Design a protein around this ligand. Structure first.
Ligand SMILES: *[C@@H]1O[C@H](CO)[C@@H](O[C@@H]2O[C@H](CO)[C@@H](O)[C@H](O)[C@H]2NC(C)=O)[C@H](O)[C@H]1NC(C)=O
Ligand SMILES: *[C@@H]1O[C@H](CO)[C@@H](O[C@@H]2O[C@H](CO)[C@@H](O)[C@H](O)[C@H]2NC(C)=O)[C@H](O)[C@H]1NC(C)=O
Ligand SMILES: *[C@@H]1O[C@H](CO)[C@@H](O[C@@H]2O[C@H](CO)[C@@H](O)[C@H](O)[C@H]2NC(C)=O)[C@H](O)[C@H]1NC(C)=O
Ligand SMILES: *[C@@H]1O[C@H](CO)[C@@H](O[C@@H]2O[C@H](CO)[C@@H](O)[C@H](O)[C@H]2NC(C)=O)[C@H](O)[C@H]1NC(C)=O
Ligand SMILES: *[C@@H]1O[C@H](CO)[C@@H](O[C@@H]2O[C@H](CO)[C@@H](O)[C@H](O)[C@H]2NC(C)=O)[C@H](O)[C@H]1NC(C)=O
Ligand SMILES: *[C@@H]1O[C@H](CO)[C@@H](O[C@@H]2O[C@H](CO)[C@@H](O)[C@H](O)[C@H]2NC(C)=O)[C@H](O)[C@H]1NC(C)=O
Ligand SMILES: *[C@@H]1O[C@H](CO)[C@@H](O)[C@H](O)[C@H]1NC(C)=O
Lengths: 597, 183
């Protein structure tokens, strides 16, 4: 007889009708993802569209309970996550146009071609052949030709589509009371009505700009080092007080610098640890690796596997004819069914990807008791952090000298310490300025602060101001460089890659403080310490039930993301770097340019 | 005693209408169930599980049904949930024995098995030891529905989706509850 009681009565008929209709779609998708045949494609698309139509009908039905009188918090969260109109609030023609341009953008990105100016019959796609030249070559002109032709002949096709997708998304987000699309994107970190844990969408921006200011005194030194070393592979092309040309960084855009490690290794006379011969000359099969991972996970206090995961998961690659696209994933088909998909081999990198996947699986196993709509990470960035700290801790010499792969003594020196820390920094702290800058640009575009006659100019200005790279050939307002990225064209959010990198390290410095560590942070392990597993499981089993700024307090002790753990983790490399630039010039000026002559 | 006629029927009934078989006055031999199978769950509450053969009473009843996996822990004196409140409630001075075992390979087929229902919408909590076979539209709002599905008027019978590729906790378990009050 209330407008609140008819909420629980309705959520029970939806938390049982969806947990069943979702299993069909998920299983039918798995059946295609591991056995690529023709009939399986339609067998998956059928169930997929069925589940989508069911969700749409439930959404248009649940608009009868006004969110203004619901008093409980869990039912409010469920109704709010189910109520959002999302897209389709536009007219019909507008929605059709938007879908068409999104598909066109994805297709143009996937199948672009760029050839030679002296032989136009031998052009290569992006994935198998271009970012391989951009990753393995060492000649200046070849990298320059690649980086310029990938943006001159595939970028110029995305501008007259982006300049319309922007307007369409702006309208779709303003028809839901958001004031722009950037607010819709940040609407994941929103928390309202907890009295002590409030978090308005407008603050997120500020928070980012108040933590990235604490990283610069390390990124600057890393940058000066990488530059002083690059100036010995391509002499007379880099000036000692300028920026780095944006094509010598290591890949097409400069997102990760990890492909530079062969040029800028500090001590090139010590091979960092790689137990790939001890694994092979001891007859390790593709199943012993997962046994070791499960043993490590049961050491800290998390449950065993489900006994339905060993029978159905596809750990090995089916040889003769079962051609199956295997990018390592961990599935959550529901109803107590957890599976892993990865064409594993016997090397080291897969020995860590196994732990990453089992971390995802432990997370998805912990919160399987909540309702259906709340089975997800606390926000869009917790999942990968939880999955990553495990692999971060499962590659330390104290661990690999106790599992058996390494020798029992294996004398260790500070040189391999520096080596490993730098190889980590060239991927962790080398992608934060770029991510922050790209997200800032996309926000300033969607909000309307940059008129559409000033896109490329502001983009390159911000790249020179923050990241520290400069364009090698002048780019006017006909090109479109940001659209030549994968996450920008297919309409994916990007801010998460900047929050995860923070959360992750915080978790470490929390759990290592429970296991009562002694040395520096990067030599720590959470294995054989049950208190760590308990402190972590206290947060794992929450899902989206509580606001994320609470589940972050249960394990750390703060309320928001911080940046002290990252610098605490990178302190040794920092102390070494600050004593390597006595002669160089830490910093960069925004006036030099490779064409200012 | 005719126990093998209730532990072995080709199919049990669903929970919302369980099957009650009353035992007459004859000789009872429990030595066959005690050494029958793994018996995932077997808890006696009044009678001596190690001395069962030494007592006897007037009448014994055998109820039988099929419930989900993680819900066996609700067939017990004084529990609460979607099963022990709307479908099958045990009193507070229970005296029988609860036994339940796995039947994953007999009641579950691929592509779903929609023949094991369970009612989850009832206006009033069930009094001890009562069954209901009603199939009237449970009306939640304030508007007469006159008997059609729609908004705030839901149909109360919903079926399990039993399938073989489930985790322990959703595979169909078979339950045979004994009550005592023959020798
Ligand atoms: C992978 O998919 C193909 C295509 O469906 C399967 O090939 C047939 O599958 C049906 C469905 O069970 C069988 O009745 C046929 O006998 C299969 N044909 C052949 C030539 O095998 C194939 O079985 C699937 N892979 C596996 C491992 O089952
Ligand atoms: C309404 O809110 C209350 C508390 O605010 C929820 O009560 C919890 O319910 C779960 C499962 O029913 C119990 O495990 C907890 O112990 C309860 N909390 C307390 C403090 O008693 C209730 O579940 C919410 N309504 C719904 C439909 O979930
Ligand atoms: C979600 O979309 C609907 C339109 O599809 C919005 O408008 C309401 O739609 C219902 C259904 O026809 C009408 O009965 C109401 O009169 C409409 N206006 C209202 C409720 O003000 C609806 O407002 C949207 N809700 C949200 C949260 O975006
Ligand atoms: C975690 O604890 C276990 C048990 O305490 C350790 O396993 C034993 O380690 C000792 C150390 O030399 C060996 O002598 C034993 O043979 C090991 N047990 C078995 C069954 O092999 C394990 O080494 C610890 N791991 C870490 C990383 O500390
Ligand atoms: C690694 O550790 C050794 C000591 O264990 C360091 O060697 C000392 O370095 C300082 C630097 O000026 C010298 O003054 C000392 O005389 C060195 N000791 C010896 C015995 O020669 C070494 O510098 C460290 N290297 C790194 C990269 O951390
Ligand atoms: C329940 O029924 C099954 C078969 O419906 C019985 O299994 C029989 O067991 C006897 C003794 O082991 C065998 O000789 C038969 O061949 C089995 N039948 C089949 C079809 O395999 C089982 O014994 C019955 N349970 C009880 C308690 O009587
Ligand atoms: C996990 O499985 C192993 C292997 O069967 C067993 O020895 C161990 O006791 C199990 N632990 C738990 C907590 O289930």
């Amino acid at each position: 007889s209330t407008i609140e009681e008819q909420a629980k009565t309705f959520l029970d008929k939806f938390n049982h009708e969806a947990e069943d209709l979702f299993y069909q779609s998920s299983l039918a998708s798995w059946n295609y993802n591991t056995n690529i045949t023709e009939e399986n494609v339609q067998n998956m698309n059928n169930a997929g569209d069925k589940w989508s139509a069911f969700l749409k009908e439930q959404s248009t039905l649940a608009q009868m309970y006004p969110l203004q009188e619901i008093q409980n918090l869990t039912v409010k969260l469920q109704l709010q996550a189910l109520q959002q109109n999302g897209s389709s609030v536009l007219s019909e023609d507008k929605s059709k146009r938007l879908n068409t341009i999104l598909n066109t953008m994805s297709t143009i990105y996937s199948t672009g071609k760029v050839c030679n100016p002296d032989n136009p019959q031998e052009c290569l796609l992006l994935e198998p052949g271009l970012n391989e030249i951009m990753a393995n070559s060492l000649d200046y002109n070849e990298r320059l030709w690649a980086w310029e032709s990938w943006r001159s002949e595939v970028g110029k096709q995305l501008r007259p589509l982006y300049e319309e997708y922007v307007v369409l998304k702006n309208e779709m987000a303003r028809a839901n009371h958001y004031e722009d699309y950037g607010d819709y994107w940040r609407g994941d970190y929103e928390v309202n009505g907890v009295d002590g844990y409030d978090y308005s969408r407008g603050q997120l921006i500020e928070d980012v700009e108040h933590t990235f200011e604490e990283i610069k005194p390390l990124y600057e030194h890393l940058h000066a080092y990488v530059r002083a070393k690059l100036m010995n592979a391509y002499p007379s092309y880099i000036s000692p007080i300028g920026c780095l040309p944006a094509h010598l960084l290591g890949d097409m855009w400069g997102r990760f610098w990890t492909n530079l490690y062969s040029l800028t290794v500090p001590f090139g006379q010590k091979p960092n640890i790689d137990v790939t011969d001890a694994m092979v000359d001891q007859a390790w099969d593709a199943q012993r690796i997962f046994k070791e991972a499960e043993k490590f996970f049961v050491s800290v206090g998390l449950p065993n596997m489900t006994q339905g995961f060993w029978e159905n998961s596809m750990l090995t690659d089916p040889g003769n004819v079962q051609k199956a696209v295997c990018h390592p994933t961990a599935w959550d088909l529901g109803k107590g069914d957890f599976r892993i998909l990865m064409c594993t081999k016997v090397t080291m990198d897969d020995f860590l990807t196994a732990h990453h996947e089992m971390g995802h699986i432990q997370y998805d196993m912990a919160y399987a008791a909540q309702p259906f709509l709340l089975r997800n990470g606390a926000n869009e960035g917790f999942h990968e952090a939880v999955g990553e700290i495990m692999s971060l801790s499962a590659a330390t010499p104290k661990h690999l000298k106790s599992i058996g792969l390494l020798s029992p003594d294996f004398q260790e020196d500070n040189e391999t310490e520096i080596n490993f820390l730098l190889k980590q920094a060239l991927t962790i702290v080398g992608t934060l300025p770029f991510t922050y800058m790209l997200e800032k640009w996309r926000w300033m575009v969607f909000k309307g602060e940059i008129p559409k006659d000033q896109w490329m100019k502001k983009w390159w200005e911000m790249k020179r101001e923050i990241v520290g790279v400069v364009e090698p050939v002048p780019h006017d307002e006909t090109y479109c460089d940001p659209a030549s990225l994968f996450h920008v064209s297919n309409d994916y959010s990007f801010i998460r890659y900047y929050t995860r990198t923070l959360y992750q390290f915080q978790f470490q410095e929390a759990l290592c403080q429970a296991a009562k560590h002694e040395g520096p942070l990067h030599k720590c392990d959470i294995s054989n310490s049950t208190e760590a597993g308990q402190k972590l499981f206290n947060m794992l089993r929450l899902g989206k039930s509580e606001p994320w700024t609470l589940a972050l307090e249960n394990v750390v002790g703060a309320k928001n993301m911080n940046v002290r753990p990252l610098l605490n983790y990178f302190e040794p490399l920092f102390t070494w770097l600050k004593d390597q630039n006595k002669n160089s010039f830490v910093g960069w000026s925004t006036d030099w340019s490779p064409y200012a002559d | 005693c005719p126990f093998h006629e209730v532990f072995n029927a080709t199919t049990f009934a669903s929970v919302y209408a369980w099957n009650r078989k009353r035992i007459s006055n004859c000789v009872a031999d429990y030595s066959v169930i005690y050494n029958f199978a793994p018996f995932f769950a077997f808890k006696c509450y009044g009678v001596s599980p190690t001395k069962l053969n030494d007592l006897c009473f007037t009448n014994v009843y055998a109820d039988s049904f099929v419930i989900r996996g993680n819900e066996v822990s609700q067939i017990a004196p004084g529990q609460t949930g979607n099963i022990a409140d709307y479908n099958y409630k045990l009193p507070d001075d229970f005296t029988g024995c609860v036994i339940a075992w796995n039947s994953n390979k007999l009641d579950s087929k691929p592509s779903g098995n929609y023949n094991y229902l369970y009612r989850l919408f009832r206006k009033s909590k069930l009094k001890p030891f009562e069954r209901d076979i009603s199939t009237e539209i449970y009306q939640a709002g304030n508007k007469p529905c006159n008997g059609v599905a729609g908004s705030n008027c839901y149909s109360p019978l919903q079926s399990y989706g039993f399938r073989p590729t489930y985790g322990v906790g959703h595979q169909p378990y078979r339950v045979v509850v004994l009550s005592f009050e023959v020798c």
